[PDB]
Structures are given as structure tokens and as C-alpha cells.
Write a protein that binds this ligand. Structure first.
Ligand SMILES: NC(=O)c1ccc[n+]([C@@H]2O[C@H](COP(=O)([O-])OP(=O)(O)OC[C@H]3O[C@@H](n4cnc5c(N)ncnc54)[C@H](O)[C@@H]3O)[C@@H](O)[C@H]2O)c1
Ligand SMILES: NC(=O)c1ccc[n+]([C@@H]2O[C@H](COP(=O)([O-])OP(=O)(O)OC[C@H]3O[C@@H](n4cnc5c(N)ncnc54)[C@H](O)[C@@H]3O)[C@@H](O)[C@H]2O)c1
Ligand SMILES: NC(=O)c1ccc[n+]([C@@H]2O[C@H](COP(=O)([O-])OP(=O)(O)OC[C@H]3O[C@@H](n4cnc5c(N)ncnc54)[C@H](O)[C@@H]3O)[C@@H](O)[C@H]2O)c1
Ligand SMILES: NC(=O)c1ccc[n+]([C@@H]2O[C@H](COP(=O)([O-])OP(=O)(O)OC[C@H]3O[C@@H](n4cnc5c(N)ncnc54)[C@H](O)[C@@H]3O)[C@@H](O)[C@H]2O)c1
Ligand SMILES: Nc1ncnc2c1ncn2[C@@H]1O[C@H](CO)[C@@H](O)[C@H]1O
Ligand SMILES: [Cl-]
Ligand SMILES: [K+]
Ligand SMILES: [K+]
Ligand SMILES: [K+]
Ligand SMILES: [K+]
Ligand SMILES: [Zn+2]
Ligand SMILES: [Zn+2]
Ligand SMILES: [Zn+2]
Ligand SMILES: [Zn+2]
Ligand SMILES: [Zn+2]
Ligand SMILES: [Zn+2]
Lengths: 460, 461, 460, 461
């Protein structure tokens, strides 16, 4: 087997050992593997996959293959691959093009190696995406391949936004399942995953004590909520910035002071609008928004000396790293850990005190400086992915008449019943015991003993 | 010359008025609506039948509605939740209120009827504000002619919303309703953080028991169960959680709780054999939060650790099988809303018996029964939604619509997200919080207006 | 029986019901009652007791009586008595003079009614004190009564400091046991007691939401640590002030921002030294120091409008309430809750917004606005009190030759072995199971299987 | 041409120097001593044998000693605790250091001997800095003539202090010592908050296991056990605590933990039958924190839940009976310092066997073995104490005292509280904290100087 490209194939044995452990940590995913094995519901599926090539993604890949699928894989981020994971996958005869520390050029080349097989477009018919880069390349650069593709299953908030834009503009060519908005994804992965992995990544990069220091978390969505808890539970004094007053209300009630980097919250683009007194006290800033330029150049100028800057949103443009490349000198401490010296561009004193520490060059810090979410959390997200792949593959959108296609061209979530069945396997993994409603109780609250237990409007 | 009320002690009005003035300073969203709408008088002509816990916080709600032009007739939705100084202050303001702490069930029904009738005949009501649905059902069953002229119902709580949706499904709901519970600044504020504040509050006032180091079992992990578990865990309790919803159970696990069932393998076959006696024999405190029926049953009550505390914070007392305890065991009142229930028999007890349980508020909602319910700054969000919902339905004038137009608007709906955000903004400012304004580039990048709404309707927060 | 003065004797039955419950919450105290009942170790003891007349003190009193002692009792604070507990004690034929809401003159009168029986000095031979007021009165006004007193058992930090002042000055006339510095007192009562009862008292007095609001705790000793946790666990944003750098270091590591009411921590006595910006954002200030004037007039002037002010140290002079009585207008909301209108002295407007809320008129707020520490915590403190009374009464200091007295005139703590045996009964009250060292393990760390398990230097 | 060292890879020096420069900015108390004492050179002539984890933080301590005038010869006190980039950077500065991560036991002993001997003969040492007491014991057993000229020992950790006090009461201690562990800015900072930071850190790096919602058992609740329990509980673990000390057990209860024993009724009867198999069958993670012997024994290891993680954060690996596991079960290395112990037999194993335990750092102290130990800003307190203790004993010059004067000073003592406070003040300033200054009236009221010390020596904090 040579249809791959990884950092070091000799890491495969190590990756396989960690894959075996991860399988024991992912009961929902492994449960699907045993349930659907004899049926082979993905036989004939040829899946283009683009998501962080971690140990956890390895278990997802092998679940899809075990259910009958062929795949070609790459990572959706230059720093998120675990090289032992990519090596174990390649060693198993699965095409994977991913390594930790890709250049942007290599990142694009890796996506192209999955799209093309032996010089020609692969006969792909399914897409699994995290962020939407692969989805967009197919629409812009390989639209004829989408004629053969039955659906897209998208993992993350940013990718869902990009799908809804295409649907709104009439440019989405195949239906999609919003995997992010399963409760066992968004309210598990996005929140608790970042709770586990944000302080993890900061410790590995800097080994900084967090207790007693000042943090500013930009955003209080699902990622912002879990990120704030990751820091608060270590004893940081956390302040939260938000543009959504409802999310700000939650931050207040959760015990956080709500502040803005700009005086009265108004960014007029001038340095005068920066709350310099506030930013001059911040030891750590974390962006979690999925928005653009939420930690801008004037904020970076005003930050306390030696503050840590990192981003756990999907794309690095949450921080204006371009400004820092243009104006300030970068000192690599170690991979994915740079000191940014604010004294000049073309040199720095080795003992300069006026620097910031930037983690993963602004790319998602939990995957860049650690290993991302733990297996038992990703088990939920990826059990949803497998169910979403099965759902859209069985629909065979590409084989339907143009009339029927119009009725099925949508961006939908999985039924709540499947959301609940994933959650049950997760609960059992903890040794939890769910109570069974009696017939009288089920009738009293108007549900079936089997579920679903909540109306679709329920927010949990 | 005003006598159109019944409260426990009108001499408590000055005290209640002092606490209302304090509460106003704790409720900026509600007092913001007062200042914003006072000149416009959007409720001029509204005549509101109100049934919700007659607390200091409800007093501020009542006076906001009146300040916006409404007349009201008020009762409590629970026999133990009234604060007598609040009821007295409202009555002293010239507002008909029929409520006191410690009503009997017969007095409870009488109070509701005193709001429905004025001088022995139906009041010219045209709006309903309800918490739980008792008033709503009485009107549908007994006063359908009054509903003809009523423009809407604004319902506060999860249980009431469920009852409204049953009526709408059956075709028996007579007037449209706003689901006030499912505003985010209600459900994810009141239901969760309010119980966080007030559950351990009520337990302390009733028993003064140390909570740290003891074992608790919370039945349910929806919004009330989430807030209740935190109220106990933050005090240092070792908290276990029961759930029938595996999604909510998954959240309990991730939040750091052990998820257990009172029944072996979670199967309640009705027999004492199915009870996990070893588990229940260790529990010092059980709290029901489900809005369901009989989730702390007779067999669980028999198996509970001696001297365990039993309480409910769901809306209705049938979450616990108190009827079994009245039939079989001897009740000794420690003090109002605190009873020792001696499992040694129905007739008499030894004053030094050790085989008893402690029941709070006779199974009624414990935060309002043994304390004062949610604090003003939390109820600010819920009651700002109530005022916006009254304005919304009153302006629509459903009762005046022709039959064909009524049919298109007979629904149970929530307020628009923009209003939810505007309530939240006033709450955030009340804490001194500063929200950031999106730049035009940022607003375009995430596809929202600089003014909001900032999230799609599918967003769960 | 008429040798008492309580607010309402008809509250006795209610207090008895709560005493029966408290007995079930105090296993260390009830274990001493049963272990020593037959031996009657306090036969002949006549104890002058001065400590908050709560339900928990009732169980302590009846324990002392059950072991053979006679007592004459009063409260050490004008607001700390629970009237149902006072009535239940009086109904049992025990002399007690205490009610909630005493004046200062009635307070001084109550202590005198324990000192004197039928107009003559009681023939007391033991003292139990909390704060040292009774101890000082006996030394200053009734020195001849101390000739027959065998010892003093002092409950709290402030009282112990006063005993140590008398000892170093040669004015102490009888030996004393420092009950406070048992670990099952100081590191249980002082810390976790205030954790339980500080937020309890604030809720009862004001029903204010605490989550999301700003607090300032003055002091970070045992009371300050417990108070800060009582607030932080409710979601308050808590800042801590301290003069001790070591205690301030613990506050930082515990996740609190450490601040001073004064610029650079320097109180020059002028309003210019007040950090007006800091204090203008504080919603709640709590004094925990046992020191004087730690919340002074200039701080009270700069506090945010409608801030809550309270003290949980032993004496009210931690707050300059005298300044507030002289210059501002007091409005009583209800007992132990006053609005202090900073608009001036001669009349307030009922709708004025510029006021502070003072709890318990500056007296210890947990006992003033709630019920103090819960029974299962006071179990530890009062088991120590009983052991201390037994210890000094057996020594019989008053009957010894002068050369032998000077040998035993000291302020002692109980031996660590008894400290541990108190803690064991507390642990068993929770259902906890300690492990028994094997002989090999005991030899390995140089202790007895029975304990003591730590050297006297150990700080826990 | 400097060759008097042995490290894993000297080309890691530049990386180590970059991390030392960062660490200096995180250690203000240590860098304050460097600035305060540089001109005075109070350790001029001092020759320090150092044996403590060769981390970045120890690097800053070493260079502070040298900056104050000392020469050192250094080794690590554990086979897995060295950071190779730190050792390289120290060796590149011309400082004799013998340490690498992953030493064998034989290489461990050799490294200590390379510090003791220079060019084959005893070095002219006159001070000792130790963590655990291995170096101290080797000198007493094997190099008594060197101790004649040594002025003192400054011992870092609880286990080492116990060994010093044993020798003192036996009359075998040859030079005085300072107990550095029992400074408050050490024991109640390093031992507690250091393990809070670094225990979950090491567990994540080794296994990447989710901790939230899983079951842990912490053996011990002293300073290390307290910090370790918080490390897991703050992550959402359901933590149970074992203790032999009822006072420490009381604190665990009040801190919100269930206190349990691995043995039924806490009594080891010498058989598997006294093991609480039901309890241990539910534990996902066990951590030993005691400084005792065999507190996680063979029968406990046999009863642990399948796939449980086993680690030790006390100083020595004999807290866990790893010898039993080596003799009876098959070890599969996952990666360095992470082994699956297959309980199916000693010979081999099926790669998909489910009946295994995961052992971290082979039972060696896990925060340093699987991560980097305590963070710089915590070690700042410990190592500022170490510098002050070295100064204090070196200035005393015990070795030069006549016999009758030595007898008056042969002791194991702590630093004065005033110095403990001055270390804390620098730590507090590092956070931006502002301590308040007592007024003269306030200082008089509580009977202290405005400069401190602020507490009596009896105070426990
Ligand atoms: N690294 C990870 O493991 C991980 C996991 C899940 C999601 N993500 C990514 O993280 C990002 C956030 O995801 P989410 O699910 O939390 O989305 P979300 O929509 O739930 O939350 C984003 C929040 O940012 C706020 N925000 C936007 N612009 C802001 C600004 N200028 N200032 C302050 N707040 C602002 C919004 O109000 C919103 O509440 C996405 O890009 C998503 O793909 C990363
Ligand atoms: N006292 C208060 O101040 C207050 C505040 C808000 C709501 N409430 C009341 O509390 C109740 C709960 O409200 P909510 O908003 O949390 O509703 P919810 O629907 O969000 O939560 C109820 C939960 O109970 C669970 N449940 C149902 N039957 C169960 C059983 N047999 N065992 C275990 N779990 C079971 C459900 O799965 C659900 O998650 C309602 O009656 C509501 O009106 C009271
Ligand atoms: N209300 C209760 O239930 C209760 C319980 C125990 C003790 N107490 C009382 O509380 C008080 C404190 O007791 P403790 O055991 O915590 O004593 P402590 O000595 O342990 O703590 C007092 C702290 O206050 C600090 N301090 C002193 N002056 C200060 C100032 N001006 N600014 C800031 N910090 C300052 C000291 O450094 C010290 O750390 C005593 O009066 C004690 O009797 C009350
Ligand atoms: N890894 C680190 O970074 C680090 C840091 C500081 C100390 N240490 C080491 O950790 C160990 C503990 O140090 P410490 O300061 O916490 O000591 P400590 O004396 O304060 O605590 C040890 C505790 O273990 C308890 N214990 C003893 N035998 C027990 C048994 N069989 N079962 C249950 N509990 C038992 C004791 O009662 C005691 O409370 C020492 O070996 C010390 O050198 C390691
Ligand atoms: N202090 C209070 N005043 C009025 N209503 C309250 C209070 N606390 C809780 N509630 C309401 O009571 C309902 C439960 O009956 C909840 O939906 C909640 O909104
Ligand atoms: Cl033995
Ligand atoms: K991972
Ligand atoms: K209230
Ligand atoms: K009490
Ligand atoms: K470190
Ligand atoms: Zn992606
Ligand atoms: Zn109601
Ligand atoms: Zn007192
Ligand atoms: Zn007025
Ligand atoms: Zn060591
Ligand atoms: Zn020892």
C-alpha cells in the first residue's frame, strides 16, 4: 500500500495501540459498528473525508470502513493531525494525506489527493466535512463530481453557516445533514470538549500556572461556555465578552464579569476606543466566536506584557496574526509556541520582556497544542456522523429524478430519537442507569416510554 | 373605602412596601418597561385575571401592569407561596388580591373565584396571566362565556404550557396563549438559576441542616433539575441524578454527577423488589424536579435512609406520594411547612423515634413554601417577558376578531427572539456588564444585523 | 421555676422539637453524653456560660448537665439568641437569661444574672466563654469569684487573643483551654460554618441574588476563607483584602483577585487614599478580621449605591457604624435589616436610591440574620468544649497550693489525640469509613495505629 | 571545553534556555532574591550538592544559587522527572549536571555519585540541597568524612523531612537541616496547588482520557491528597477519598467528598475477602498521595475495575505494589511512561484484551513523570525558600563550630515566619495583588508590628 502520505509510517504501531484504547472509550461509535456490521449499510459508499486526523477520527474512519465504506481522507487543519493516528490509518490500507505542521500549500495538496485518485477524479458519492473547505472546493472546482454525490455530513458550526449560505443562494448542489446541532454534538463536543482540552493545550504549550491570573474569553456560545469553565475551574479570574445579550446574561449568572475590549462596547477603529486599563490586566485571551478579527491589532498592542493569546474557534482569522507577522518579531519557543516581540520586526533581545505568547499560530489551540477533545466526548459527535452518513447514503439523492431532488435539497438535523439513542450509549459508558417511565407516567407527560422525551423546541 | 381583597394581615403593608421599593432596584428590565411604556399606556383597557405566587416579585409585576394602564384581580397559584407582606402591600395600593400563606385547598379555590367574580358576577376580564394552568382550566370548564371576551393567556411555567398544548391539540383551547416559559431569559434563567439560588435556601430555613458531605438524589435533570443539582453540589453535597431522558442524563454525567435510578436496572415493576434499597438507604435528601407524577413513590419512601429530607420543587405536589404518607404514617409538625413523618405507624409516635423522614412544604414547591422563591433580579427576566406578552396579546385583540381570523391566530407561541435579547440586555446592564457592538464587517461576516437577533431560531444556548 | 428571663416561654415545645433533631445531627456531642453519663465527670461543676443561645448551644448545655454540671447561661451577642432554644432551656429548669434583640444594657444585665444568684455571687467554679466579655467582667468586677474557679474554656479567636493578653500581662487568674485552635474547631467551625451560614444570612435578610455581583471580603483567615467560598460558590465575583501576605497568597491560589480599599494599600486617613473606582463597583462587603475599623467611614462613603454591608467577625467595631449613626439616616426594613441613607441625617425619602443595606447593625451576621452554624458543624466545636470543661474541672486548679498553681497557669489546647477522636465521630456521622493502618504501615510513618497521626507542627 | 556533565542531548540547550527565560518571568520571588543579594554574594564559597528533579524550575533555582556565588554539582532525585532540555541548558552554562529522563536505577545511583565525586575523589562540598533524602542518606552511610565539612542540608519534601527527623532522634544526623517543606509558601502552596495543577495534566498527557463523569479514588487527604482531589473534582470527576487520619477525613467530608476505605470497615484482614470488591469495581482512576507503603496493594489492584488508571503522586513508587504486577502480569508499553498491565497472565496477552490496568510512570510520581510537574509560578515559592535556607545554614558555618557549639545547633528547623511572609508577598505581587498595610492603631489592636509577622507560630492557615 502506497496511496497515502503521512509524517512517519513507523508510528503506526503506537497509533494502533491508542486506537485500541480509544475504542474502549467510544461505546456509542463501537455500538454502531456491532449493530450494523452484518448489514453493511455503507457498502458502495465512497466517502471524501476532511476533518482533524486524530486518534478519535481514526475510530470514526474504521467504523465507516467496517460498515462497508471506502474513504479518502485529509485533515481540515494544518496542526490538528496526530501523526501516530495518520500512520495507523495508512498502515490499515486507507488513503490518508495528513501530517502535523503542514504548510498551506501542503494543506491544499492533501485535500486534492483525496479528491483525485491516480490522476483522475475519484468516483466519490459521499462527503464528510469539518469547516466546509472541502465542500467549497467541490462546488467551486469540481462541480461535476457533485452530480454523483448523495450528501454532505458537516461537523462544525462554521461549516453549517457556510452550508446555509449556499442553500440561501441556491448554490448548494447536494443535501446535507447538520451534525453540529445534535444535542450529543453541540452541547457535548463544543462545550465539554473545550472544557477538557483548552486548559490542557495551554499547559502543554506554556506550563503556565492559571490559578489566580486574569483571563478574557471572547464569546460565550457553546465553545465560549466550555472554554470559560476550563479556565475558571483552574482558578482563573475569567471575564467574558459577548455581542449576544442572551449569552452575556448566561455568563453573568454563571459568575463571570461581562466586559468589552472597547469603551462602551463601541469599536470605532481607533486606538482611543480600546479599554487600555482592562486589557493591560489580562494574562490570557481566548477567542471562541467563529467571527472575524475579534482580537484585533489595537487589542494586541494594549495587552499586558507576556499575555498568552490563543484561538479555539475554527479559523485563525479570529486574531489579527497578519498584523503581528507584519510588525513584530516571532521567536519559536517550540512547535506551535511563539513569542511575539512587540519591540520590532527585524530582531529582538533574547531577554526582552515585552512579548506575547501565541499558541498554534492562532489555529485552533486544543488540537494544535494538545490532542483536541477526548475520545469519550468525540464518541457522541462521531456516532452522529455515522448515522448521518447512513441516512444520506440510503437516500441516494444523486440517483433521484430532478423532480424528487428539489423536495430533498435541504440542510437538516438528525431525528431527536437518534440523538437520544446516541446519548443512551454515552450514559451507559459512564455506568449511568436511565430510569424507564411507567405507562402512567408516559401518558401523564404525553410521550412514549421509548421516547422521544422532549418536543423539538426543547433547548436542554 | 377599598375592601375588595382578602389578605392575612393588612398591617404588613408598610413592610411589604419597603421590600417592593428594594425589589424595584433589583429588577431593571421590568422597571425599564415601566419607564419606556408609561406615556403610551399600552395596557389601558386591559383587565387581567392573574394567578401566580403572591410574592414581592409578583408585586412588582402587578404594579408594572397597572402602571402601563391595566386593572387586575389577583390570586396565588399555590397555597404556601404567598408572602403576606407582599399581598398586604398590594391590597393597600387599592388592587384586588386574594392570597395568604397557608391556605387550605378550599380557600385556594375560593381565592381564584374571587378574582373571576366581581360583586357576585363575572368580571369584565379580557386577559389572563397564569402560572400552572389552574385558572386557565377553571375558565374553560366553568366560565366559557368569559373566555369569549378574553384576548389571550400568558403562561409562566413548563407545566402550564404542557396543559395549554394539550388543549390546543384537542381543539379545546378557546384563546391564544404566549409560552412565556420558553423565552431564554425565562427557562434558562428562572428555571435553572432561580432554583440554584432558592433550593438550598429553603432547605436551610426549614431544617438548618448542614449540606456539605451528605448524599443527595435529584429526580430529573431538565432546567429545574440542573439548577437544583447545582444548588446542592455547590454546598458540597454528593449529588446523584435520576433521569428518563438519556440526553439530559448525558449532561448530568458531563456536569460531574453520577446518574442512578431508584429502581434496579431502571425498571419500576411496581414491586418492592425492584427498589434499589442499598442506594436509597444512603440518601440524606431527595428532591423531585420533573413535573411528572409519582417520581418519589411509596416504595422509595419506605426505603429512604432514616431522617432523610424529602422535598419537591416541581409545580405540583403529586411528584411525591404524600397521600401514602398521610394514609400510613404519623405527621409531627416541627414548625410551619416542616413535618417529621414517623414511619412507625399512623396513630401516635414516640417523640424520640428515629425512624422518620422530614417533609418540606407538605410536598408543595419547596423554594416558595419554605423560603421566598427566586430572587428579584432573576424574576426580572421572567416578568419582563410577562409584560411584553401581555402587551403582545392585548394589542392583537383576539376576542374582537371574526371567526375566520381567530382560527388563523389560535396558537401557543413564544415571544420573538429580538424581545428575548432586549430583556437580556437590561439584565446584563443591571450587573454592570458591557456587551460588545459588532462592526459592520463582523455583522456581515456572521450574517446578522448589528441590532440582532444574533442567533437562528434553532439555537439552544 | 422562675430563675430565667426569655422572650417567650411558650416557644419551649418548638425548641424541644428542634433540639431532638439537633441531637441526631451532633454525634460527637451525643457520643460524649453516652460515654460519660454513668461516670458523671462534671458532678459538682457550676459553670458560668456565655455564648450565643442557639439550638446548638442548647445541646451543649444539656450535655454539660447530663454529665452532672449546673449552669447559669447568657448569650454573648444581643442578636444571636434563638428564642425557641432559650425557652426550651428555661422550661427544663436551667437558669438562662437571653433573647434575640437585646439592648446593650439588657446584655450587661443578662451576664450579671448568671454571675449573681439571689443577689449574691454564685458559687461558680467553671467558665465557658465565647469572645471573653464574661471573662473580663469576672477579672475586673468579681475577682474574688475567680479564687474558686478552676478554669475557663474559650470558644473563639478573639476571646483567645484576650486570654493571651492577660497571660502575658500577668493578669490571668485561672487557667484556660483554647478551644478555638482544635482543628475540629478552627478548621471546621470557623471556615465551613461561615461557608454554610454567610450566604444563608444574606439571603434571609435581603433575598438578593448573589450570582454575577461583585463582593469584597476583608480578611482571609479561617472566617475569611469560609466566607469567600460561601459567596464564590453562589457565583459572586469575589475580591479579597488582607494584611497577611501568606493569607493573601492562598486567596490568589484559590482563584481570587487580592485588592486593597486603599491606593497601594496605604491608609493615610484621607479620602484621597480610598480606591474610589474599586469600591464604587462593590455590591457586597463582608468583614472577617477580628480587627478594628477595617470598613471605615471613607470606604462606606465610596461604596456603590445599594451595596450590602455586614460583619461576621465577633465584634461590630470592624465596621464604623458609629459614623453611620451620627451622619446618615437609618430606615429599618425589618429586624436586623436597615437601609442607611447617605443623603444626610435629617430625614430620608422613601424612594431615595443612595443608601446602603446594613445587616444585624454590624453584629455577626450569620447569627444575627440566620441561625449561625448548623448543628453538624457545631458538633465538633462543642464536643471540644465538653472535653475542655472535663479537663480543667478534674485538674481542680482553685484547690491547689500556690506553687502548684503557677505551674499550671497557662492557655492550653486539647491534645491532638482528643482532636482526632472528635473528628472520627464527625466522619462516622457522614457515613465515612477511615482506613486502619497495618502495623507495618504505622511503623513506616512512625505513628500508632490508634494515632495521633501527625506531629504537633502539622497545619492540615 | 566543558565536559563535566552527562545529559540526554546537549543540542536541546537552546530550547531549554528559551524556557528558562520564560520561567524567570514566572518566578518573581526567586528573581527578587537574585536581585536583592547579587551584590552581597552571600553564597560565595558555597559548594552545593543538589539532588532534585532536573526541571526548568530547578534550572532557575540552580542559576539563582550560582548568581549568589555558589558552585553546584547536580542530579535528579527521580528517574523520570528530568526535563532533558533543562538539563542540557544547565550543562551548556558550564554547570555539572548528571540527569536525563528515563534513567535506569543503576544510572540513577551513578548520577548521584558523579555529583559527590569530582575527578574520582570527593568534591569539596559544604552544603546539601535535597528532595526525598536519597543523597542525604548516601552521604551518611558512605561519605561521613564529607559531612564533617558540610554546613547543612535544606530538604524540600515531606518524605525527606521525616527521614531527617528519624536520624535526629536516633542521634545519627551529622549536620543541621532546614525543613523547607513546612514553610507555608511551600507545603500549603507547592504540595497542594502544585498537584491541583499538575495531576490532571499528567493524566491527560498520558491517556487523553475524559475525566468528567468518571469515578476516582484518592488515597490520602494531606496536602498532596487535598490538591489531587481538587485536580480531579474540578474536572468533573466523582471523587472518593480514603484516609487513616480522621481529622483529614473530616476535611474531605466538609470539602464535599465521600470518605471510603478499600477494605470492608477499613480493616485489612490479610485476605482478598476484606477487599471492598464492589467499591473498587467501580473506580476508573486511583491515585496514591500518602508517602506511606503499600496503600494500593496487590488485592486492591486485582479488584479494580477493568481499564482503570493507576498512578502515584507521592514521592516514592512503593505506595503501589508494582512489584506484584511485574511478577504476575504482562506489561505492554503504550508509549513512554504509559503501560497497560494485562491481568490475564504473565506470559503474553491478546492485543484486544479488555482486562488490563493503565499504569502511569511505572508508579513513579506522576506529575513529573508524565508531564512537567508543578508550574514555575508555584515552584517560585518553594525555591525562594530553598535559597533563603541555603543562605541561613551557609552563614551559620556549622562545620567550623567547636563540638560544644555544634551540639547546641544540631537540629531540623523551619525558616522564621517573617521570611515565609516575605516570600508570600513577592508571590502575591506577581499576581498583581495589593496587600493592605495595617494602621498603627490596627497593629496595636491585634498585637503585631505593621511589618509582621502577622500570626503566632501556632497558626495553621
Ligand atoms: N476547537 C474545537 O474543538 C471546536 C469545537 C466546536 C466548535 N468549534 C468552533 O468554534 C467556533 C464557535 O462555535 P460555537 O458552537 O461556540 O458557536 P456559537 O454560535 O454557539 O458561539 C459563538 C459566539 O460568539 C459570539 N460572538 C460573535 N462575534 C463576537 C464578537 N465580536 N465579540 C464577542 N462575542 C462574539 C456570538 O454571540 C456567539 O454567542 C466555531 O468556529 C466552531 O466551528 C471549535
Ligand atoms: N419552583 C420553581 O420556582 C420552578 C421554576 C421553574 C419551573 N418549575 C416547575 O418545575 C417542573 C420542571 O420544570 P422544568 O422546566 O425543569 O421542566 P423540564 O421538562 O425541562 O424538566 C423535567 C425533567 O424531568 C425528567 N423526568 C420526567 N419524568 C421523570 C422520572 N420519572 N424520573 C426522572 N426524571 C424524569 C424529564 O426527562 C425532564 O428532563 C415543572 O413542573 C415546572 O413548572 C418550578
Ligand atoms: N461568626 C462566626 O460564626 C465566627 C466563627 C469563628 C470566628 N469568628 C470570629 O471571626 C473573627 C475572625 O476569626 P478567624 O478565626 O478567621 O481569625 P484569623 O486570625 O484566622 O483571621 C483574621 C484575618 O484578618 C486579617 N486582617 C486583619 N486586619 C486586617 C485588615 N485591616 N484588612 C484585611 N485583613 C485583615 C488577618 O491577617 C487574618 O488573616 C474573630 O473575631 C472570631 O472570633 C466568628
Ligand atoms: N509529586 C509532587 O509534586 C509532590 C509534592 C509534594 C509532596 N510530594 C510527596 O507526596 C507525599 C505526601 O506528601 P504530603 O505533604 O501530602 O504529606 P501529608 O503528611 O500532609 O499527607 C499524607 C497523608 O496520607 C495519609 N495516609 C497515610 N497512610 C494512609 C493510608 N494507608 N491510607 C490512606 N491515607 C493514608 C495520612 O493520614 C496523611 O494525611 C510525600 O511522599 C511527599 O514527599 C509530592
Ligand atoms: N419569587 C417568585 N415570585 C413569583 N414567581 C416565582 C418566584 N419564584 C419562582 N416563581 C415562579 O414559580 C413557577 C413555579 O410555580 C416558576 O415557573 C417561576 O417562574
Ligand atoms: Cl502488617
Ligand atoms: K484527544
Ligand atoms: K424572593
Ligand atoms: K443553626
Ligand atoms: K513545570
Ligand atoms: Zn474543520
Ligand atoms: Zn403556579
Ligand atoms: Zn461570643
Ligand atoms: Zn418619595
Ligand atoms: Zn525528590
Ligand atoms: Zn515523621
Amino acid at each position: 500500500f502506497t496511496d497515502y502520505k503521512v509524517a512517519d509510517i513507523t508510528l503506526a504501531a503506537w497509533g494502533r495501540r491508542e486506537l485500541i484504547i480509544a475504542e474502549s472509550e467510544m461505546p456509542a461509535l463501537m455500538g454502531l459498528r456491532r449493530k450494523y456490521a452484518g448489514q453493511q449499510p455503507l457498502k458502495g459508499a465512497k466517502i471524501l473525508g476532511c476533518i482533524h486526523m486524530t486518534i478519535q477520527t481514526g475510530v470514526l474512519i474504521e467504523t465507516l470502513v467496517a460498515l462497508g465504506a471506502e474513504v479518502r481522507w485529509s485533515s481540515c487543519n494544518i496542526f490538528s493531525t496526530q501523526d501516530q493516528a495518520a500512520a495507523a490509518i495508512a498502515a490499515a490500507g486507507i488513503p490518508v494525506f495528513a501530517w502535523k505542521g503542514e504548510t498551506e500549500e501542503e494543506y491544499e495538496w492533501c485535500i486534492e489527493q483525496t479528491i483525485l485518485k491516480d490522476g483522475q477524479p475519484w468516483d466519490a458519492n459521499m462527503v464528510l466535512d469539518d469547516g466546509g473547505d472541502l465542500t467549497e472546493i467541490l462546488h467551486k472546482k469540481y462541480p461535476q463530481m457533485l452530480e454523483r454525490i448523495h450528501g454532505i455530513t458537516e461537523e462544525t458550526t462554521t461549516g453549517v453557516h457556510r452550508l446555509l449560505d449556499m442553500l440561501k443562494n441556491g448554490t448548494l448542489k447536494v443535501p446535507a445533514i447538520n451534525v453540529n446541532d445534535s444535542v450529543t454534538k453541540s452541547k457535548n463536543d463544543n462545550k465539554y470538549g473545550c472544557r477538557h482540552s483548552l486548559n490542557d493545550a495551554i499547559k502543554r504549550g506554556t506550563d503556565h500556572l492559571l490559578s489566580g491570573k486574569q483571563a478574557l474569553v471572547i464569546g460565550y456560545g457553546d465553545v465560549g461556555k466550555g472554554s470559560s469553565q476550563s479556565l475558571r475551574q483552574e482558578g482563573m479570574i475569567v471575564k467574558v465578552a459577548e455581542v449576544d445579550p442572551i449569552c452575556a446574561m448566561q455568563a453573568c449568572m454563571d459568575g463571570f464579569e461581562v466586559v468589552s475590549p472597547y469603551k462602551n462596547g463601541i469599536n470605532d477603529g481607533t486606538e482611543a476606543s480600546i479599554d487600555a486599563a482592562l486589557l493591560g490586566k489580562i494574562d490570557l485571551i481566548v477567542t471562541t466566536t467563529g467571527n472575524v478579527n475579534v482580537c484585533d491589532a489595537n487589542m494586541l498592542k494594549a495587552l499586558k506584557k507576556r499575555a498568552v493569546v490563543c484561538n479555539i474557534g475554527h479559523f485563525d482569522n479570529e486574531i489579527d496574526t497578519a498584523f503581528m507577522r507584519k510588525n513584530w518579531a516571532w521567536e519559536e519557543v517550540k512547535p506551535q509556541v511563539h513569542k511575539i516581540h512587540r519591540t520590532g520586526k527585524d530582531g529582538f533581545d533574547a531577554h526582552n520582556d515585552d512579548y506575547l505568547i501565541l499558541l498554534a499560530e492562532g489555529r485552533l489551540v486544543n488540537l494544535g497544542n494538545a490532542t483536541g477533545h477526548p475520545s469519550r466526548i468525540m464518541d457522541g459527535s462521531f456516532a452522529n456522523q455515522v448515522l448521518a452518513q447512513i441516512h444520506l447514503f440510503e437516500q441516494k439523492y444523486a440517483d433521484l429524478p430532478a423532480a424528487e431532488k428539489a423536495k430533498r435539497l435541504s440542510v437538516e438535523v438528525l431525528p431527536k430519537k437518534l440523538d437520544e439513542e446516541v446519548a443512551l450509549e454515552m450514559v451507559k459508558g459512564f455506568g449511568g442507569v436511565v430510569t424507564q417511565l411507567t405507562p402512567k407516567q408516559a401518558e401523564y407527560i404525553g410521550v412514549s416510554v421509548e421516547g422521544p422525551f422532549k418536543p423539538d423546541t426543547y433547548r436542554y
